[PDB]
Design an enzyme around this catalytic site. Structure first.
Site, PDB file in Angstrom:
ATOM      1  N   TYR A  49       0.812  -1.220   0.000  1.00  0.00           N
ATOM      2  CA  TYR A  49       0.000   0.000   0.000  1.00  0.00           C
ATOM      3  C   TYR A  49       0.846   1.272   0.000  1.00  0.00           C
ATOM      4  O   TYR A  49       0.307   2.357  -0.260  1.00  0.00           O
ATOM      5  CB  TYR A  49      -0.985   0.023   1.188  1.00  0.00           C
ATOM      6  CG  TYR A  49      -1.961  -1.152   1.241  1.00  0.00           C
ATOM      7  CD1 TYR A  49      -2.197  -1.975   0.139  1.00  0.00           C
ATOM      8  CD2 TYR A  49      -2.651  -1.438   2.421  1.00  0.00           C
ATOM      9  CE1 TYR A  49      -3.062  -3.061   0.221  1.00  0.00           C
ATOM     10  CE2 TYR A  49      -3.528  -2.513   2.511  1.00  0.00           C
ATOM     11  CZ  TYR A  49      -3.717  -3.335   1.417  1.00  0.00           C
ATOM     12  OH  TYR A  49      -4.568  -4.421   1.530  1.00  0.00           O
ATOM     13  N   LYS A  78       1.008  -7.494   5.900  1.00  0.00           N
ATOM     14  CA  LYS A  78       0.965  -8.566   4.915  1.00  0.00           C
ATOM     15  C   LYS A  78       2.269  -8.612   4.120  1.00  0.00           C
ATOM     16  O   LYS A  78       2.805  -7.574   3.715  1.00  0.00           O
ATOM     17  CB  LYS A  78      -0.228  -8.410   3.950  1.00  0.00           C
ATOM     18  CG  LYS A  78      -1.518  -7.945   4.640  1.00  0.00           C
ATOM     19  CD  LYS A  78      -2.727  -7.959   3.708  1.00  0.00           C
ATOM     20  CE  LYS A  78      -3.926  -7.262   4.330  1.00  0.00           C
ATOM     21  NZ  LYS A  78      -3.820  -5.770   4.255  1.00  0.00           N
ATOM     22  N   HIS A 111      -0.079 -12.205   1.744  1.00  0.00           N
ATOM     23  CA  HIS A 111      -1.067 -11.283   1.159  1.00  0.00           C
ATOM     24  C   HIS A 111      -1.892 -11.962   0.062  1.00  0.00           C
ATOM     25  O   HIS A 111      -3.119 -11.771  -0.009  1.00  0.00           O
ATOM     26  CB  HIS A 111      -0.332 -10.036   0.638  1.00  0.00           C
ATOM     27  CG  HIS A 111      -1.193  -8.829   0.443  1.00  0.00           C
ATOM     28  ND1 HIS A 111      -0.667  -7.557   0.520  1.00  0.00           N
ATOM     29  CD2 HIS A 111      -2.513  -8.705   0.151  1.00  0.00           C
ATOM     30  CE1 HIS A 111      -1.645  -6.701   0.274  1.00  0.00           C
ATOM     31  NE2 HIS A 111      -2.772  -7.366   0.043  1.00  0.00           N
TER      32      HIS A 111
HETATM   33  N1  LIG Z   1      -6.074  -8.655   1.630  1.00  0.00           N
HETATM   34  C1  LIG Z   1      -6.351  -8.069   0.461  1.00  0.00           C
HETATM   35  O1  LIG Z   1      -6.004  -8.549  -0.641  1.00  0.00           O
HETATM   36  C2  LIG Z   1      -7.142  -6.792   0.491  1.00  0.00           C
HETATM   37  C3  LIG Z   1      -7.779  -6.351  -0.663  1.00  0.00           C
HETATM   38  C4  LIG Z   1      -8.608  -5.242  -0.615  1.00  0.00           C
HETATM   39  C5  LIG Z   1      -8.778  -4.571   0.584  1.00  0.00           C
HETATM   40  N2  LIG Z   1      -8.104  -4.982   1.678  1.00  0.00           N
HETATM   41  C6  LIG Z   1      -8.209  -4.203   2.992  1.00  0.00           C
HETATM   42  O2  LIG Z   1      -9.573  -3.924   3.227  1.00  0.00           O
HETATM   43  C7  LIG Z   1      -9.750  -2.494   3.368  1.00  0.00           C
HETATM   44  C8  LIG Z   1     -11.152  -2.087   2.983  1.00  0.00           C
HETATM   45  O3  LIG Z   1     -11.409  -2.385   1.595  1.00  0.00           O
HETATM   46  P1  LIG Z   1     -11.334  -1.264   0.439  1.00  0.00           P
HETATM   47  O4  LIG Z   1     -10.388  -0.184   0.817  1.00  0.00           O
HETATM   48  O5  LIG Z   1     -11.095  -2.025  -0.815  1.00  0.00           O
HETATM   49  O6  LIG Z   1     -12.816  -0.668   0.344  1.00  0.00           O
HETATM   50  P2  LIG Z   1     -14.102  -0.411   1.283  1.00  0.00           P
HETATM   51  O7  LIG Z   1     -13.670  -0.329   2.696  1.00  0.00           O
HETATM   52  O8  LIG Z   1     -15.129  -1.401   0.866  1.00  0.00           O
HETATM   53  O9  LIG Z   1     -14.581   0.995   0.705  1.00  0.00           O
HETATM   54  C9  LIG Z   1     -13.758   2.175   0.874  1.00  0.00           C
HETATM   55  C10 LIG Z   1     -14.490   3.319   0.220  1.00  0.00           C
HETATM   56  O10 LIG Z   1     -15.743   3.568   0.912  1.00  0.00           O
HETATM   57  C11 LIG Z   1     -15.829   4.939   1.259  1.00  0.00           C
HETATM   58  N3  LIG Z   1     -16.569   5.041   2.510  1.00  0.00           N
HETATM   59  C12 LIG Z   1     -16.142   4.643   3.750  1.00  0.00           C
HETATM   60  N4  LIG Z   1     -17.015   4.847   4.705  1.00  0.00           N
HETATM   61  C13 LIG Z   1     -18.092   5.422   4.049  1.00  0.00           C
HETATM   62  C14 LIG Z   1     -19.322   5.917   4.515  1.00  0.00           C
HETATM   63  N5  LIG Z   1     -19.686   5.887   5.801  1.00  0.00           N
HETATM   64  N6  LIG Z   1     -20.159   6.465   3.605  1.00  0.00           N
HETATM   65  C15 LIG Z   1     -19.784   6.504   2.323  1.00  0.00           C
HETATM   66  N7  LIG Z   1     -18.646   6.075   1.769  1.00  0.00           N
HETATM   67  C16 LIG Z   1     -17.834   5.547   2.696  1.00  0.00           C
HETATM   68  C17 LIG Z   1     -14.385   5.430   1.340  1.00  0.00           C
HETATM   69  O11 LIG Z   1     -14.359   6.855   1.106  1.00  0.00           O
HETATM   70  P3  LIG Z   1     -13.391   7.881   1.872  1.00  0.00           P
HETATM   71  O12 LIG Z   1     -12.108   7.126   2.227  1.00  0.00           O
HETATM   72  O13 LIG Z   1     -13.223   8.980   0.854  1.00  0.00           O
HETATM   73  O14 LIG Z   1     -14.148   8.342   3.099  1.00  0.00           O
HETATM   74  C18 LIG Z   1     -13.824   4.656   0.181  1.00  0.00           C
HETATM   75  O15 LIG Z   1     -13.889   5.278  -1.064  1.00  0.00           O
HETATM   76  C19 LIG Z   1      -8.609  -1.937   2.534  1.00  0.00           C
HETATM   77  O16 LIG Z   1      -8.366  -0.556   2.752  1.00  0.00           O
HETATM   78  C20 LIG Z   1      -7.464  -2.852   2.965  1.00  0.00           C
HETATM   79  O17 LIG Z   1      -7.032  -2.456   4.259  1.00  0.00           O
HETATM   80  C21 LIG Z   1      -7.310  -6.070   1.660  1.00  0.00           C
HETATM   81  O1  LIG Z   2      -4.157  -6.600  -2.856  1.00  0.00           O
HETATM   82  C1  LIG Z   2      -4.681  -5.714  -2.176  1.00  0.00           C
HETATM   83  O2  LIG Z   2      -4.701  -5.696  -0.876  1.00  0.00           O
HETATM   84  C2  LIG Z   2      -5.468  -4.605  -2.827  1.00  0.00           C
HETATM   85  O3  LIG Z   2      -5.191  -4.527  -4.222  1.00  0.00           O
HETATM   86  C3  LIG Z   2      -3.960  -4.014  -4.570  1.00  0.00           C
HETATM   87  C4  LIG Z   2      -3.296  -3.080  -3.790  1.00  0.00           C
HETATM   88  C5  LIG Z   2      -2.122  -2.559  -4.285  1.00  0.00           C
HETATM   89  F1  LIG Z   2      -1.463  -1.639  -3.524  1.00  0.00           F
HETATM   90  C6  LIG Z   2      -1.599  -2.899  -5.511  1.00  0.00           C
HETATM   91  C7  LIG Z   2      -2.268  -3.844  -6.267  1.00  0.00           C
HETATM   92  C8  LIG Z   2      -3.441  -4.444  -5.802  1.00  0.00           C
HETATM   93  C9  LIG Z   2      -3.999  -5.568  -6.622  1.00  0.00           C
HETATM   94  O4  LIG Z   2      -3.912  -5.571  -7.851  1.00  0.00           O
HETATM   95  N1  LIG Z   2      -4.533  -6.585  -5.946  1.00  0.00           N
HETATM   96  C10 LIG Z   2      -5.026  -7.774  -6.623  1.00  0.00           C
HETATM   97  C11 LIG Z   2      -4.039  -8.914  -6.734  1.00  0.00           C
HETATM   98  C12 LIG Z   2      -2.737  -8.841  -6.252  1.00  0.00           C
HETATM   99  C13 LIG Z   2      -1.878  -9.927  -6.351  1.00  0.00           C
HETATM  100  C14 LIG Z   2      -2.307 -11.114  -6.924  1.00  0.00           C
HETATM  101  C15 LIG Z   2      -3.599 -11.156  -7.418  1.00  0.00           C
HETATM  102  N2  LIG Z   2      -4.101 -12.386  -8.027  1.00  0.00           N
HETATM  103  O5  LIG Z   2      -5.149 -12.326  -8.657  1.00  0.00           O
HETATM  104  O6  LIG Z   2      -3.429 -13.402  -7.933  1.00  0.00           O
HETATM  105  C16 LIG Z   2      -4.466 -10.090  -7.331  1.00  0.00           C
END
Ligand SMILES: NC(=O)c1ccc[n+]([C@@H]2O[C@H](COP(=O)([O-])OP(=O)(O)OC[C@H]3O[C@@H](n4cnc5c(N)ncnc54)[C@H](OP(=O)(O)O)[C@@H]3O)[C@@H](O)[C@H]2O)c1
Ligand SMILES: O=C(O)COc1cc(F)ccc1C(=O)NCc1cccc([N+](=O)[O-])c1
Ligand SMILES: O=C(O)COc1cc(F)ccc1C(=O)NCc1cccc([N+](=O)[O-])c1
EC number: 1.1.1.21
Length: 316
Positions: A49, A78, A111
């Site tokens: 990130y 991660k 991750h």
């Molecule tokens: N392990 C993985 O591969 C992976 C992948 C994706 C995500 N994650 C983790 O999960 C976290 C959450 O997922 P995400 O960031 O993809 O998206 P999310 O939490 O589903 O959505 C974030 C979005 O929702 C908005 N938002 C938040 N609270 C709101 C509210 N009360 N009303 C309206 N809009 C609102 C935010 O706007 P503002 O910020 O402008 O307020 C932002 O644009 C990530 O940040 C990361 O830490 C992990």
């Molecule tokens: O992976 C996350 O937590 C959120 O998505 C991203 C965040 C970043 F900072 C940069 C890239 C991604 C992203 O493309 N994430 C998706 C992703 C990653 C690695 C492998 C796969 N896969 O399909 O095997 C998918």
């Protein structure tokens, strides 16, 4: 509802955390400071990130101010895909610890199951745009994660974006020393994940729901895409409970015994999103929200769809 869930390492994890993917580096320090001030005790981070230094500034300042004690925080990061090699895992963890200005992580996740060629680029590509794999497998990477527990760098280890066969592979690992504590996966009303959640829960692995609001700020969003926050059916459930749509979307996974990590950089939303411990969704509300599943997955990478460990060819 109780604020923490017991993990299979004996530690307690706050069921609500703050997400940090896409939080700009000039905004995330204040976002995390506000979050801690208004009650958050769990922050979800990752090296990929590119903002862990700034997250760490906030954590360190709140520890120095004695707003919180370190033992009261639950900090997650991660291991990125270009560090799956045996000889790179510890240094990757150490860089995250240095940036977050911590001496341990509460939880460290693989991750993604896909390992990539080590180097400066987070997505090394061939000349046709396919990601360049590394020959590492999930079991040798797991052994490297276990060493981090035994060295005191992390209190718990887990996985993220693993399908049920990949989870099973670790659970069946010869000589397994520590089971995964958590599998962090995408989960929301349009991708409800019943099968994978039941598998993980049946094995004592806690599931964390990422993108619980549908990640409307993901860089590849399109104007015509489905919108959870704007779905009139979810808005109606929220209105009936005198809550916001986001509050319903956060409470939903909590009542499935999941951890949930909504992201915001907006101070008023950070505070709003935490006000979810004082209302309940009925069983009928829960089943109605589950009925909205469309298998709509927002988080995956086209460059990875031929990697041998790509997780999303399997049904679950
Ligand atoms: N392990 C993985 O591969 C992976 C992948 C994706 C995500 N994650 C983790 O999960 C976290 C959450 O997922 P995400 O960031 O993809 O998206 P999310 O939490 O589903 O959505 C974030 C979005 O929702 C908005 N938002 C938040 N609270 C709101 C509210 N009360 N009303 C309206 N809009 C609102 C935010 O706007 P503002 O910020 O402008 O307020 C932002 O644009 C990530 O940040 C990361 O830490 C992990
Ligand atoms: O992976 C996350 O937590 C959120 O998505 C991203 C965040 C970043 F900072 C940069 C890239 C991604 C992203 O493309 N994430 C998706 C992703 C990653 C690695 C492998 C796969 N896969 O399909 O095997 C998918
Ligand atoms: O492919 C990426 O790197 C990030 O994801 C996208 C990027 C775009 F430019 C356009 C769309 C996506 C997207 O739909 N991503 C989510 C997605 C869900 C399911 C399967 C896949 N896949 O690549 O096989 C991708």
């Amino acid at each position: 509802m109780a604020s923490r869930i017991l993990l299979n390492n004996g530690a307690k994890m706050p069921i609500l955390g703050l997400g940090t993917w896409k939080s700009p580096p000039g905004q995330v320090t204040e976002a995390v400071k506000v979050a801690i001030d208004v009650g958050y005790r769990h922050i979800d981070c990752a090296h990929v990130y590119q903002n862990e230094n700034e997250v760490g500034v906030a954590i360190q300042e709140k520890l120095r101010e004695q707003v919180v004690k370190r033992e009261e925080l639950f900090i997650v990061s991660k291991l990125w895909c270009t560090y799956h090699e045996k000889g790179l895992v510890k240094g990757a963890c150490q860089k995250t610890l240095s940036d977050l200005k911590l001496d341990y992580l509460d939880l460290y996740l693989i991750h993604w199951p896909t390992g990539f060629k080590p180097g400066k680029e987070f997505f090394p590509l061939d000349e046709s745009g396919n990601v360049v794999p590394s020959d590492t497998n999930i079991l040798d990477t797991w052994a490297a994660m276990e060493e981090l527990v035994d060295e005191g760098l992390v209190k718990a280890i887990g996985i993220s974006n693993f399908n049920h066969l990949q989870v099973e592979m670790i659970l069946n690992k010869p000589g397994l020393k520590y089971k995964p504590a958590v599998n962090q996966i995408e989960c929301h009303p349009y991708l409800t994940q019943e099968k994978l959640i039941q598998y993980c829960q049946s094995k004592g692995i806690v599931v964390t729901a990422y993108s619980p609001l549908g990640s409307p700020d993901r860089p590849w969003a399109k104007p015509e895409d489905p919108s959870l926050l704007e779905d009139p059916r979810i808005k109606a459930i929220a209105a009936k409970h005198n809550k916001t749509t986001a509050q319903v979307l956060i409470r939903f996974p909590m009542q499935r015994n999941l951890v949930v990590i909504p992201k915001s950089v907006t101070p008023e939303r950070i505070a709003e999103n935490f006000k979810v411990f004082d209302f309940e969704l009925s069983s009928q509300d829960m089943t109605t929200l589950l009925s909205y599943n469309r298998n709509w997955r927002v988080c995956a990478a086209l460059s990875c769809t031929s990697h041998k460990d790509y997780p999303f060819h399997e049904e679950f």
